[PDB]
């Protein structure tokens, strides 16, 4: 008959774990808090068999914008998600805007995930807003010169 009490204890433990995780990630740029959603599990009888966690819902409200200053740092306002790719080509999304250039001069975050975007091609290069998104690179190669054709 512990059908209800055990489920209630498990739900309370899940909620407490969610609260503790929210407390722990308090200083994680790009973190969104979570809240457990509970539902009852009446089954045929009217005795109220127990409770269950229907899921965990994020809170996608914009956090405070703090001017750390480092140029690469980019904060995102309102809706939107930064798009990254791992070494195996999978696509991921993140609100954390702490970026750095790696040794191959590829814009990556702290975990090494390559930031993606519309690349530029041509001479002079133009933003290929149509071109499928590609990892952004910042080459240090010397820039060639254009012969004067219009003045």
């Amino acid at each position: 008959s512990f059908s209800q009490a055990v489920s209630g204890l498990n739900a309370a433990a899940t909620n407490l774990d969610v609260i503790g995780n929210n407390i722990a990630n308090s200083a994680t740029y790009g973190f969104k808090s979570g809240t457990a959603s509970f539902a009852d599990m009446f089954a045929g009888s009217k005795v109220g068999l127990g409770v269950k966690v229907a899921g965990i819902t994020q809170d996608f409200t914009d956090g405070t914008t703090t001017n750390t200053g480092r140029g690469l740092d980019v904060a995102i306002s309102q809706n939107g998600f930064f798009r990254l790719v791992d070494s195996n080509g999978s696509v991921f999304y993140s609100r954390n805007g702490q970026f750095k250039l790696d040794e191959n001069r590829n814009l990556v975050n702290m975990q090494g995930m390559q930031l993606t975007g519309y690349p530029a091609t041509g001479t002079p290069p133009t933003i290929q807003q149509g071109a499928n998104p590609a990892p952004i690179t910042i080459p240090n190669t010397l820039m060639a010169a254009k012969s004067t054709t219009t003045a």
Binding site: L9, A12, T65, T68, A75, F82, Q129
Partner: protein, 99 residues
Amino acid sequence: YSNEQEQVLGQIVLANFANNEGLASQGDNVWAATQASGVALLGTAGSGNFGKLTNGALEASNVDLSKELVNMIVAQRNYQSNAQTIKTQDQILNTLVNL
């Protein structure tokens, strides 16, 4: 550059989803799009349905510590209440077995 001329190397793309609550977090402050969240709609900042980008700044978490502490207190009390229920059922079963 040093020749009093600049170049454009790329434009950061932004993604918007029909269901924000459907994104499954993979850790390392990173989300992955799944069936419930739908396909990602791609665009640029400041155009369409995307907010602009703030330079030289980072977005902090939206976790308020006071609310978290109060919710922790309430959840602890609920957990202890459920434990009391468990103890009640334990005493009932002990009474029946001792018969």
